[PDB]
A paper describes a structure:
Here, we report three inward-facing conformation structures of [name] [name]: the apo state, bound to the natural auxin indole-3-acetic acid (IAA), and in complex with the polar auxin transport inhibitor N-1-naphthylphthalamic acid ([name]). TM1, TM2, TM6 and TM7 form the scaffold domain, and TM3 to TM5 and TM8 to TM10 form the transporter domain.
In the bottom of the intracellular pocket, we identified a density that fitted perfectly with [name], which is in a similar position to the IAA binding site. The [name]-bound structure is largely the same as the apo structure, although residues around [name] are slightly altered, providing better coordination. Thus [name] preserves the binding mode between IAA and [name], since V51, N112 and I582 participate in binding of both ligands. However, the interaction between [name] and [name] includes more hydrogen bonds owing to the additional benzoic acid group in [name]. Notably, this group protrudes into the pocket formed by TM5 and the crossover region. The benzoic acid group of [name] may reduce the mobility of the crossover region, and thus arrest [name] in the inward-facing conformation. Compared with IAA, [name] had a markedly higher affinity, with a Kd value of about 0.15 μM, consistent with previous indications that [name] is an effective inhibitor and shows high-affinity binding to the integral components of plant membranes. No binding was observed between [name] and the Y145A mutant.
Numbering used by the authors:
A (entry chain B), C (entry chain A): 1 to 211, 455 to 622
B (entry chain D), D (entry chain C): 4 to 118
Write the structure that this text describes.
């Protein structure tokens, strides 16, 4: 079983996270230090400078030649069992949509791994399980936050064609997009225009206004609009230059010099402190914590803490994990939900209230849940 | 549905002539009267001319073309005619119609050039 | 002399400070990320949370029972030679004022010791001279930033009496101030009122408007207005609880527990990174760097880098310092000017343009000046 | 300079009387006409009444006292009189003058009470 000293090692690593979150909730709600426009310049700094340098500090120290390949395939099998049962729902049931296929994939299979997940598992099980959580942060930034970006851009590019070309879209040859437009999700006026050719062909051009198609064409429109959203993103330069350095530093034994290693480490020490500070400012700016009713909030904390760790119990036993590697895999599935699935769903308006409960009301009850599996597994 | 536009009326004329352009629409669903006409020089920054919009009450003309270009609606033949009067020599560019059925459809076939 | 490896140890500790300052200058001036109201909520955080916890991390680790008492008296003799020559100027020359007695004391004898001074001297001379710079940060926060607060409140409380009681003020008995008022420096309307008694006495009461006296009375008005400015200050709780813990921790060998020591250290790791980030935002919001003309800017960098380290050469030789303790004392006098003498002079309007050049144009030329004494002393 | 104010006119009266208050200023430098009068109940949040300001053109009265309290300037004797008319019973509080020579000077000696 566990000893009473282990309960002090968990509290040593997690009570310093809630202290920086209540000081930011109290300084807006209670004692009123920050104006809501002054409070918007702190979240703008954490999102651009502090956290994309916290993820460089972890990925550049990863050793990609000695990853744990059996643990890392039980994490990539969770997100195929889940993503295939939702495919047998919107293709076989009659009321299945794509607004719910994105939301039920973000709730059940994408937790908060970088800010909360690495200090929590390192205190529960030791310094080897903090080396396994970095291997999961690599696979979310580079695969599962890119597949989810292909779904929001396919959801938006089929609305713009199915609304404006209801009876004609079978004859579209090619679709261009002017470079003024970066997201075609209704925020800009988005005038469209067609070139009628000599034999029933059609050249669609999406423009900026001022006061089904074939799959050889739809897959071309999406890759243009994904590349424009992928180079304006700070987490795609933290993972491009994080992985590229760790492939070189761990083969020829190059150690990064102390001018450059301290120039990065002066801002990334503000990573884990300011991220939890920026997360308590956000739960002070919403009107209520439970912002989606009491039915849709129990639904957000039953996909997250039950259907999560009951589909990595059958995807970790069907691979060959036992002992401690089974216990680390179940506990990291019960982490609260990450923030980047909320950043996407606030922009595209795909249920922004169900994914703002589960980030805020996830964090407040995450600590007596993960300490409830840690007692029950250890028995 | 094999949609197709038919444009005509293009020709070479002097300064002070009279032309009668054409835009014959066919092969459509239920159309709304929002057809247009504009210019496209070999340079950039094109300029819009006229409108034959919903009720025929107000027509969005430009500044220099107000009170001199007659636009006309014919919903029977589904063809909007743009009658030009006192044709200024700066009309060498291409003119074409922009019928709107929710998304603007247009062609390219004219011969408008004023000498 | 110095070796070429020592020039790399200085650059290892100081090039990471200018990197966090150009990223904040460029993100406002050049690439325009922060709105000037969003940029005001970052300075509000650094001034309240980041730096008053950076100064707690240093003062609580000081050992006050083994301070260097001979080095620490050559620092407190600089600021008596300077403060007595200015007293023989406004009392003997005819154009001496008190607006210049404050400004010439802030330029020549109060440098930037906490953010820049501790990493610079620790790389030049080693880990013992970073233990001497903490002994100077203690004496600025607790003595020389409190005497300077008695001068701004005496300058303001003699204007309000000499303007409104020009021919009568010799008969004032007592002056009360209502607790609505916190600073009487013209920002609020400040209606005054008198109680004429039966024998030429007078009770002055300072109020809030809506649409010489004896020295037994002037010393009572100042202590009220200083106590109200001293409890609304974050740097007076970092020094009250910093010193009180270090007097207890270093006698009974009490070590602070790891719950509390990590709860403080999560925000204070953002101290030295965000302070230099907030210092480059401020040099992007001013119109020009040299904001006071070319005559008054050479006057701000000749009191600071010449009259500073030429009055600690005669106040460190007249005490008994030699060798390395003479070399650390001269170099720390050539540091650029601190920020708290600018925070005061912006509020009270006592030359806010001469003390905003010397903070900004101090930092940009401070590194080729202190590396010019470090070469010349070592010869 | 041994400055001194002299206030008089206080007395007990019924509802509907007529009183004539006094504020005799003496021992001053060059004075400006900004003298006032107001009330101070044993409760809080006092209320201002009148003004005899610079030119005698506009006098800042309150709402309930407009057109019924006569104020008068006498720069020869340096005394501003406040004549009260139709004295309402809610005038038990203390009344006193607030001569302004840059900083407001005032006394306390009245006996204003309306029964
Ligand atoms: O927490 C996540 O979703 C996450 C997971 C793996 C890798 C990266 C992230 C991540 O970028 N977070 C955040 C992005 C922007 C702001 C954030 C603020 C607080 C915490 C996380 C933030
Ligand atoms: O730099 C100083 O003046 C100083 C010297 C000794 C002790 C403390 C300080 C000090 O509080 N600085 C600062 C106060 C507010 C903001 C600051 C921002 C940047 C740097 C220093 C700041």
């Amino acid at each position: 079983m566990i000893t009473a000293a282990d309960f002090y090692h968990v509290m040593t690593a997690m009570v310093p996270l809630y202290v920086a979150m209540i000081l930011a909730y109290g300084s807006v709600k209670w004692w009123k230090i920050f104006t809501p426009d002054q409070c918007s310049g702190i979240n703008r700094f954490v999102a651009l400078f502090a956290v994309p340098l916290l993820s460089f500090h972890f990925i550049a120290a990863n050793n990609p030649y000695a990853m744990n390949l059996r643990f890392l395939a039980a994490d990539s099998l969770q997100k195929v069992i889940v993503l295939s049962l939702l495919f047998l729902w919107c293709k076989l049931s009659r009321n299945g949509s794509l607004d719910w296929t994105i939301t039920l994939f973000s709730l059940s299979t994408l937790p908060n791994t970088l800010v909360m997940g690495i200090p929590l598992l390192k205190g529960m099980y030791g310094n080897f399980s903090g080396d396994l959580m970095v291997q999961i942060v690599v696979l979310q930034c580079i695969i599962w936050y890119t597949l989810m970006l292909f779904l929001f851009e396919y959801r938006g590019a089929k609305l713009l064609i199915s609304e404006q070309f209801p009876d004609t879209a079978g004859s579209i040859v090619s679709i261009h997009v002017d470079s003024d437009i970066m997201s075609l999700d209704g925020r800009q006026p988005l005038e469209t225009e067609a070139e009628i050719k000599e034999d029933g062909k059609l050249h669609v051009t999406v423009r900026r206004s001022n006061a089904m198609p074939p799959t050889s064409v739809m897959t071309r429109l999406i890759l243009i609009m994904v590349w424009r959203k992928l180079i304006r993103n700070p987490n795609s330069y933290s993972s491009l230059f994080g992985i590229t350095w760790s492939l070189i530093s761990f083969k020829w034994n190059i150690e990064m010099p102390a001018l450059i290693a301290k120039s990065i480490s002066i801002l990334s020490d503000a990573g884990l402190g300011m991220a939890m500070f920026s997360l308590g400012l956000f739960m002070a700016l919403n009107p209520r914590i439970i912002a989606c009713g009491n039915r849709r909030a129990a639904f957000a904390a039953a996909m997250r803490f039950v259907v999560g760790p009951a589909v990595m119990l059958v995807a970790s036993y069907a691979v060959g994990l036992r002992g401690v590697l089974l216990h680390v895999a179940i506990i990291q599935a019960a982490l609260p939900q990450g923030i980047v699935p909320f950043v996407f769903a606030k922009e595209y308006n795909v249920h922004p209230d169900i994914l703002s409960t589960a980030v805020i009301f996830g964090m407040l009850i995450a600590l007596p849940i993960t300490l409830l599996y840690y007692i029950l597994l250890g028995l | 549905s094999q949609v197709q536009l038919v444009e005509s009326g293009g020709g070479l004329v002097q300064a002070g002539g009279s032309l009668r352009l054409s835009c014959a629409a066919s092969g459509f669903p239920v159309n709304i009267s929002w057809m247009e006409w504009y210019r496209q020089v070999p340079g950039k920054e094109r300029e819009w001319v006229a409108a034959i919009q919903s009720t025929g009450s107000y027509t969005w003309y430009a500044d220099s073309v107000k009170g001199r270009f007659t636009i006309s609606r014919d919903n029977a033949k589904n063809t909007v005619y743009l009658q030009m009067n006192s044709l200024k020599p700066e009309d060498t560019a291409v003119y074409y119609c922009r019928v709107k059925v929710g998304a603007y459809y247009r062609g390219q076939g004219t011969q408008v050039t004023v000498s």
